[PDB]
RNA sequence: UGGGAGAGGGUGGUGGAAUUCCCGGAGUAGCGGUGAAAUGCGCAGAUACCGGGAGGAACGCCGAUGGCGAAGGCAGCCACCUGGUCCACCCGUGACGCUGAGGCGCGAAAGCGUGGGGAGCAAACCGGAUUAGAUACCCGGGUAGUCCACGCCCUAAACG
RNA sequence: CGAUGUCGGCUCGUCGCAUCCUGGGGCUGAAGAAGGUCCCAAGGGUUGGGCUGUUCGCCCAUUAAAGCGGCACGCGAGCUG
RNA sequence: GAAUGCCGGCAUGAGUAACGAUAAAGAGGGUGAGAAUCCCUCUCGCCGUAAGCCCAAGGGUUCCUACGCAAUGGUCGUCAGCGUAGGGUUAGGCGGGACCUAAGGUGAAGCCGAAAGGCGUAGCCGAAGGGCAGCCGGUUAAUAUUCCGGCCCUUCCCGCAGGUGCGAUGGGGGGACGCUCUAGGCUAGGGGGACCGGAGCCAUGGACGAGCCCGGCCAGAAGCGCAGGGUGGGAGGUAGGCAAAUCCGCCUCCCAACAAGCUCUGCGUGGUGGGGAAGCCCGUACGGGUGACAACCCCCCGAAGCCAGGGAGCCAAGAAAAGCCUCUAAGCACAACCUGCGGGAACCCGUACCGCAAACCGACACAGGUGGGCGGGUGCAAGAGCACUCAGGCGCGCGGGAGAACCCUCGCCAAGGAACUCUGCAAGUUGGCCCCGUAACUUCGGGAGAAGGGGUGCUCCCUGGGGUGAUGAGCCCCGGGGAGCCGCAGUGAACAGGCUCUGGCGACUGUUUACCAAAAACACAGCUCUCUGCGAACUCGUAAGAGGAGGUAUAGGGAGCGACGCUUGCCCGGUGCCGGAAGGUCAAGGGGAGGGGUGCAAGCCCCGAACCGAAGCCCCGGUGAACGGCGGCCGUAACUAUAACGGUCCUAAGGUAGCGAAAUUCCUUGUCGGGUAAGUUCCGACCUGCACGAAAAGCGUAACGACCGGAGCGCUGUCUCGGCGAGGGACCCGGUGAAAUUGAACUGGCCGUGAAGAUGCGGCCUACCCGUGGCAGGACGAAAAGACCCCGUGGAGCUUUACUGCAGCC
RNA sequence: GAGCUAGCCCUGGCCAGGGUGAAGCUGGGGUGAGACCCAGUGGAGGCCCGAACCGGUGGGGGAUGCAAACCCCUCGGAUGA
RNA sequence: UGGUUCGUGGAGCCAUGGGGGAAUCUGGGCGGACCACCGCCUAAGGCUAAGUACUCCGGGUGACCGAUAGCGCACCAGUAC
């Protein structure tokens, strides 16, 4: 629903921000925040391991419930929908009838005021979490555990959704957001709805700096490098790739698969 | 212009000083060499 | 006021046949294709058969010189929302009417922008035949597109 | 090669003559005027511009003429670059 | 006797360059053995968002005083930041620790590693962050928020008095937070004043005057007042805050909707405490007395500071823990806690001095570098700008003369204006504010300060708005109209764009080669390809572990292109990558046909053929925004010319669109046209593209550009073509006094000669001895064991289908 | 050895004064309802002019220097990568 | 795989990281692949002086030096810098 800009500077010609229309509460719940360690790419050795990170806006981390079999049977009233900086989705503030407050991430089509509940016996209705063995086949669904009681791994980004295409025995068959078809165990919880903020991927950042506010630093091509630095480096003049196109560490980056071949997960994976 | 030696009594003691020699097995051999030399200051004098 | 018909339109949902692909079984020396052949597919087990699964598009019989709409145009079924129209009763208002330069809206198909989707067909493109030659007609592949949402384009043998 | 700084421009000259002009002369297919060619002759003079890093060259407008070469293709402990 | 040899010593250059900002000096008087340089007075100049105060870092005695001058001071020195000696730094309230946590470090539990060691939850350490109780003056030669004076506070510990279930390192609240823009009321700060208090002064033509000059404050408990911040109050129900809770959280009705009530700050007032100018008189270097019984009043401007956790908006969504409050748990409830009072107790370290600099970092009393706060006044529209100047601090630790060339930094110029030159390089024109007015083009924002104009000072009169005060005077902020005055000139000084047309590259702001390159290179939003289903892929690591990520296909990695507009054609034969349970080949291992060596034999020990044996390669397909590639020869059309057309060779295919003598064009200054008097550059065309061409992208593109090219207008010392003037050097004198270089030197020209470029050889010529200011032709001048070339079976960096290995992967 | 320098993490600070005037609000116009168009308010931006601050474009000086990167004139950014 | 003179060699012996895996005197290793004969030792637990190496320190001696030599230092030196 994505809010655009008159071209009164050169960067504001193309820059789009999101609407923030579903946001009801501008300031996060005090008992559910804890500080993000900004890391900068830098591991415990101090070395860069992911290049070109840092410089971001400071963030407080919002504790998300990715389990929701913690609190089976206890319904919750949706009290607020909020901005999480740490993820593409929005988040929903739940006041449970206990008075435990939790965040969950926000489906498409939540309203404030409404009631959600996890359950094998919850209604099949947006925001409720069931095992996958109890959701009817053909529903779209999100927040999907991959192995049971290990918490939600699958379909967490903004707009994303997985669909149940079958059962087979203990296991159910998911169309993942990649289009991968995968056997997931039936007792893995999953949370119905697709995820909201589906207009995330139409955001055009507009200028250089809005990359830097998110902690994405400048990315340097290997053709601008020198042959110690990169395979693509060097060449008096500009340079075609000269060789099959290649990472800084030597391996190819047009086509080369590196799914590990003897992985035990591949017996659970149908297509790709 | 801004030259190289910009002194700091925190940094001098925490880097070159005696308690940070004796963490490292290289740094204990520093004081061993300076004792065997006979130096009057095994560590840099900070105050 | 009381009724009637209709693919009139918008939204949500849903049913079956068939094409393609994938998986399993069985099964052989050929299948497609044409005027005829060839490209092509096939002993790495194709076509032809059965069973399961996924996906998209269009809805056979009803069905026609039929209906509906101002035009473009509209066809499985279900529900919601909604426009037009016709008949009867002759009840009310009481000339309130006709057309309409501009304006405003709608406007097949092709085309364009963002995202999705892509089974079949199919510009461009690639082969194989015809021919003196083929940038075509015929044949085998095949990308945009054809589909959806939103925004444009504003055309025609938009014809009675 | 335990270093002789390379092109072009500027500044500053100085030298040679196989002379562009000026001076003297022979022959002329030299009527006159203007020329051609050769001999003597360096004392002096030998312009300002457009283009190009240019030297050279091509044009513009003049001129009596718009000379060719040497001096480490003179001259960077003189300058530019 | 040589090694550009090592160490030391002393010479040459040479009384030469220089003496470290062109902010500036002159005189009188003292001390002294000795004064331009030390102290005092007068005159002059310089800084004054500092070149003036206060913090922090760093430095470590440099502070003050007394006595000195060998060395240090770029001269001198009686002076000093120097030598000797003595003195000086006082804290419950300032900073830090017996408080807390952040990144990080360490690290019992635990994980890993040949050893050394590497990780790691809780914990602990870790500070310009959070927490916490002191303001104003006075004394010293030198310390003070530290001592003294006044006023006011915080912790403990022990007592009594009155209240309450008290009670944890445990639960909860709070602490607690972004950027930008702001309202109200204050304070700091400043301006004015006829009012108040002052020593005094009428000068030189006038003035005894609401004259001139100086000053009209500071802190301050309780209690009021004015601003403002935080906050709902009961009742039940309760399974969540890992035990328990009356607390918190979540429901359900009742009264508020407000700050009404509670607290809590800020600011005024406040008992009382203190300060108190100019001028004059002095005896120090620095200070004192008087002026004073001082006055200590009123207006205006007003903050970026306070109320503070204020309000509004926005996306990029903005630390933790303790102090503090509350709630229970054991234990206790003769306790323990809270409020009031009294008595008592309150440790360790720093404190001097410099601190945009002569005391820090630069070997130096070095024109460089160094974080935070105050930083007055007037005018210029505003300002931390600029000019002058309060307080305050300086005249930069060599001077005196002279008035050449030459150099640096300035000023001016006849006539001409780019003729200079690689280039208007440099320098000049323009310059601030107000009002007219402003083109192509465009992404409708811009282009725009387009361009080009007019106004600009002062006096008098009339006149409209606000803010503070009562609607009023005054004080302040803004305007309008009319009439005049002066000068060459009115932003009268200083600070303050030259403009336009056109092309190339890159969309734009940005980034880089610290110390010769700021660009068309890098980056950039944006496009595509590819990988990656999560103990992800990728990366660091032997491992453990960690980043990715406390992310989950709208996410993460890798590669290329690089906003946007219109587009990205053909070749999959070779290389890469992807898909193929067939087939060829393929190692260990299985398998033993058969044979061998020894034994008197049972035996023991060897080879060893079929056949079964993975990945990989061969093979079959796919794949270009993967690596890459994208032709040649003949003939033909009613005049030549040309070839729409055809024939033919080869290829995997034979360059499509769009550009094109281009950042690409050798021939080349191609050829036409435009500009010019004249144009190897420029702009527009043709295509004969040596050798453009579609994501190492193609062709365009408004705006942007300290990028690169061409042209014109204005303007000028760039030039014709120079001239004059100013200052800092240069020159002379006094003081101090280097350097690279140097075989020794008694060191001329020509023509020859010589290892082929002679002061030194030969012949001739010329020439008394020695300096100073200058110029650079030579001494193959100095400096660097040439960096271009070659050599060395010299070395490093980089590449690959060179060789051979290794990590990694299968 | 990261007290220079490059990147990142934690915690603080700094950016005088002027211009332009996006969204959004309010009134009005408009329509069946709208889109939309006027004003007024508003105060956005890797916006503009320019000190501190960060740089280092062109020229000149310097060249055994004040300086082993300096000085003068000029110039770029200056609410943000 | 390492050690030994042993660099795969006819490669034994000794120690081993991986796989298989006995016996207790009629049992086992060895004498350089292997076999026979003849011989030599008794693994898979550990301790053990002296003879050997060095010179921070004390002493003796020198066809060793004599302040550019001898230690870096004869001297308040691992100091000043
Ligand atoms: Mg928290
Ligand atoms: Mg760590
Ligand atoms: Mg470490
Ligand atoms: Mg890049
Ligand atoms: Mg490069
Ligand atoms: Mg490197
Ligand atoms: Mg490489
Ligand atoms: Mg390359
Ligand atoms: Mg090239
Ligand atoms: Mg009737
Ligand atoms: Mg009538
Ligand atoms: Mg249409
Ligand atoms: Mg269509
Ligand atoms: Mg489309
Ligand atoms: Mg087809
Ligand atoms: Mg076809
Ligand atoms: Mg018709
Ligand atoms: Mg040479
Ligand atoms: Mg020499
Ligand atoms: Mg002659
Ligand atoms: Mg003559
Ligand atoms: Mg003659
Ligand atoms: Mg003649
Ligand atoms: Mg004649
Ligand atoms: Mg010209
Ligand atoms: Mg030129
Ligand atoms: Mg030449
Ligand atoms: Mg000549
Ligand atoms: Mg020559
Ligand atoms: Mg020459
Ligand atoms: Mg030259
Ligand atoms: Mg140059
Ligand atoms: Mg050059
Ligand atoms: Mg000799
Ligand atoms: Mg010698
Ligand atoms: Mg010497
Ligand atoms: Mg001398
Ligand atoms: Mg002299
Ligand atoms: Mg001399
Ligand atoms: Mg001299
Ligand atoms: Mg001198
Ligand atoms: Mg005397
Ligand atoms: Mg400090
Ligand atoms: Mg200190
Ligand atoms: Mg010092
Ligand atoms: Mg001292
Ligand atoms: Mg004295
Ligand atoms: Mg002295
Ligand atoms: Mg003495
Ligand atoms: Mg002296
Ligand atoms: Mg000195
Ligand atoms: Mg004396
Ligand atoms: Mg002193
Ligand atoms: Mg002293
Ligand atoms: Mg203690
Ligand atoms: Mg204690
Ligand atoms: Mg502590
Ligand atoms: Mg702690
Ligand atoms: Mg550790
Ligand atoms: Mg250990
Ligand atoms: Mg830790
Ligand atoms: Mg602190
Ligand atoms: Mg603090
Ligand atoms: Mg304190
Ligand atoms: Mg005081
Ligand atoms: Mg003092
Ligand atoms: Mg006191
Ligand atoms: Mg209690
Ligand atoms: Mg807490
Ligand atoms: Mg707590
Ligand atoms: Mg005041
Ligand atoms: Mg008076
Ligand atoms: Mg008088
Ligand atoms: Mg006053
Ligand atoms: Mg006051
Ligand atoms: Mg007061
Ligand atoms: Mg309540
Ligand atoms: Mg409980
Ligand atoms: Mg209120
Ligand atoms: Mg009070
Ligand atoms: Mg007084
Ligand atoms: Mg006085
Ligand atoms: Mg607030
Ligand atoms: Mg703690
Ligand atoms: Mg002190
Ligand atoms: Mg002090
Ligand atoms: Mg300062
Ligand atoms: Mg110094
Ligand atoms: Mg230095
Ligand atoms: Mg010093
Ligand atoms: Mg000095
Ligand atoms: Mg200095
Ligand atoms: Mg400076
Ligand atoms: Mg500074
Ligand atoms: Mg001020
Ligand atoms: Mg001022
Ligand atoms: Mg004035
Ligand atoms: Mg002012
Ligand atoms: Mg101004
Ligand atoms: Mg200020
Ligand atoms: Mg100033
Ligand atoms: Mg003064
Ligand atoms: Mg001086
Ligand atoms: Mg004059
Ligand atoms: Mg002139
Ligand atoms: Mg003139
Ligand atoms: Mg002119
Ligand atoms: Mg010229
Ligand atoms: Mg010329
Ligand atoms: Mg030019
Ligand atoms: Mg210029
Ligand atoms: Mg002017
Ligand atoms: Mg233009
Ligand atoms: Mg405009
Ligand atoms: Mg103007
Ligand atoms: Mg006047
Ligand atoms: Mg006021
Ligand atoms: Mg008023
Ligand atoms: Mg005038
Ligand atoms: Mg000016
Ligand atoms: Mg060009
Ligand atoms: Mg750029
Ligand atoms: Mg472009
Ligand atoms: Mg700009
Ligand atoms: Mg830029
Ligand atoms: Mg550089
Ligand atoms: Mg360098
Ligand atoms: Mg530069
Ligand atoms: Mg693009
Ligand atoms: Mg897109
Ligand atoms: Mg590794
Ligand atoms: Mg991990
Ligand atoms: Mg994590
Ligand atoms: Mg991706
Ligand atoms: Mg990516
Ligand atoms: Mg590129
Ligand atoms: Mg490009
Ligand atoms: Mg366009
Ligand atoms: Mg292509
Ligand atoms: Mg290919
Ligand atoms: Mg291929
Ligand atoms: Mg192929
Ligand atoms: Mg393969
Ligand atoms: Mg074998
Ligand atoms: Mg075998
Ligand atoms: Mg075998
Ligand atoms: Mg195989
Ligand atoms: Mg012909
Ligand atoms: Mg042909
Ligand atoms: Mg083509
Ligand atoms: Mg041309
Ligand atoms: Mg012409
Ligand atoms: Mg012409
Ligand atoms: Mg021409
Ligand atoms: Mg052209
Ligand atoms: Mg051409
Ligand atoms: Mg070319
Ligand atoms: Mg190209
Ligand atoms: Mg190319
Ligand atoms: Mg390409
Ligand atoms: Mg282009
Ligand atoms: Mg352009
Ligand atoms: Mg341009
Ligand atoms: Mg001149
Ligand atoms: Mg002169
Ligand atoms: Mg002068
Ligand atoms: Mg002298
Ligand atoms: Mg000679
Ligand atoms: Mg001679
Ligand atoms: Mg001789
Ligand atoms: Mg001389
Ligand atoms: Mg000379
Ligand atoms: Mg000279
Ligand atoms: Mg020379
Ligand atoms: Mg030389
Ligand atoms: Mg050499
Ligand atoms: Mg070099
Ligand atoms: Mg060789
Ligand atoms: Mg070699
Ligand atoms: Mg390996
Ligand atoms: Mg650093
Ligand atoms: Mg400002
Ligand atoms: Mg508006
Ligand atoms: Mg603004
Ligand atoms: Mg800006
Ligand atoms: Mg600026
Ligand atoms: Mg400041
Ligand atoms: Mg700096
Ligand atoms: Mg830089
Ligand atoms: Mg510069
Ligand atoms: Mg320079
Ligand atoms: Mg500037
Ligand atoms: Mg500018
Ligand atoms: Mg061996
Ligand atoms: Mg061996
Ligand atoms: Mg061998
Ligand atoms: Mg061996
Ligand atoms: Mg073993
Ligand atoms: Mg073993
Ligand atoms: Mg054996
Ligand atoms: Mg043996
Ligand atoms: Mg044996
Ligand atoms: Mg034997
Ligand atoms: Mg034996
Ligand atoms: Mg034994
Ligand atoms: Mg001894
Ligand atoms: Mg001797
Ligand atoms: Mg010695
Ligand atoms: Mg001696
Ligand atoms: Mg020695």
Q: What's this model, at a glance?
A:
Chain A: Keywords: Ribonucleoprotein, Ribosomal protein, RNA-binding, rRNA-binding. The structure is cut from a larger assembly and holds chains A (272 residues) and B (47 residues). With 272 residues, chain A is mainly beta.
Describe the structure.
- Chain A is mainly beta and 272 residues long.
- Chain A contains one helix and 15 strands.
- In chain A, strand 3 and strand 4 form a beta hairpin.
- Chain A starts with 32 loop residues before the first strand and ends with a strand.
- Chain B has 47 residues and is mostly helical.
- Chain B contains three helices and no strands.
- The radius of gyration of chain B is 12 Å and the shape is elongated.
- Classes of the chains: A mainly beta (272), B mainly alpha (47).
- The chains hardly touch.
- One magnesium ion (MG) binds next to loops of chain A.
- Chain A binds five RNA strands through strand 3, strand 10, strand 12, strand 13 and helix 1.
Shape of chain A from CA axes? globular
- Cα Rg of chain A: 22 Å
Which shape of chain B, going by the Cα principal axes?
A: elongated
Q: Which percent band covers the strand fraction of chain A? A: 15-25%
Largest sheet of chain B: none
* Number of beta-strand segments of chain B: 0
SS-based class of chain A: mainly beta
Percent helix range of chain A: under 10%
| Computed CA radius of gyration of chain B, to the nearest angstrom | 12 Å
Strand content of chain B: under 5%
SS class of chain B: mainly alpha
First-residue to last-residue Cα separation of chain A: 32 Å
Hetero groups in this structure are: magnesium ion
């Amino acid at each position: 629903a994505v809010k655009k800009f008159k071209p009164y500077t050169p960067s504001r010609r193309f820059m789009t921000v999101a609407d923030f229309s579903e946001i009801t509460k501008t300031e996060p719940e005090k008992s559910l925040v804890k500080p993000l360690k900004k890391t900068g790419g830098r591991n415990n050795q101090g070395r860069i391991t992911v290049r070109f990170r840092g410089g971001g806006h400071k963030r407080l981390y919002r504790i998300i419930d990715f389990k929701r079999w913690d609190k089976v049977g206890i319904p919750a009233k949706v009290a607020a929908i909020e901005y999480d900086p740490n993820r593409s989705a929005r988040i929903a503030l739940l006041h449970y009838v206990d008075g435990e407050k939790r965040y969950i991430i926000a489906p498409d089509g939540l309203q404030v005021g409404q009631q959600v509940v996890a359950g094998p016996d919850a209604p099949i209705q947006v925001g409720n979490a069931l095992p996958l063995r109890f959701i009817p086949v053909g529903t779209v669904v999100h927040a999907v555990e991959l192995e049971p009681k290990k918490g939600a791994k699958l379909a967490r980004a903004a707009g994303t959704s997985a669909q149940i295409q079958g059962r087979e025995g203990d296991y159910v068959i998911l169309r993942l957001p990649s289009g991968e078809l995968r056997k997931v165990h039936g007792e893995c919880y999953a949370t119905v709805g697709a995820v909201g903020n589906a207009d995330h991927k139409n955001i055009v950042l507009g200028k250089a700096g809005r990359s830097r506010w998110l902690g994405r630093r400048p990315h340097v091509r290997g053709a601008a490098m020198n042959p110690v630095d990169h395979p693509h480096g060097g060449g008096e003049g500009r340079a075609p790739r000269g060789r099959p196109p290649a990472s800084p560490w030597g391996w190819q980056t047009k086509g080369l698969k590196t799914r590990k071949r003897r992985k035990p997960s591949s017996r659970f994976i149908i297509a790709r | 212009m801004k030259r190289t030696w910009q002194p700091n009594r925190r940094k001098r003691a925490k880097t070159h000083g005696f308690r940070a020699r004796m963490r490292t097995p290289g740094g204990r051999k520093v004081l061993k060499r300076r004792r065997q030399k006979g130096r009057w200051r095994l560590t840099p004098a900070v105050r």
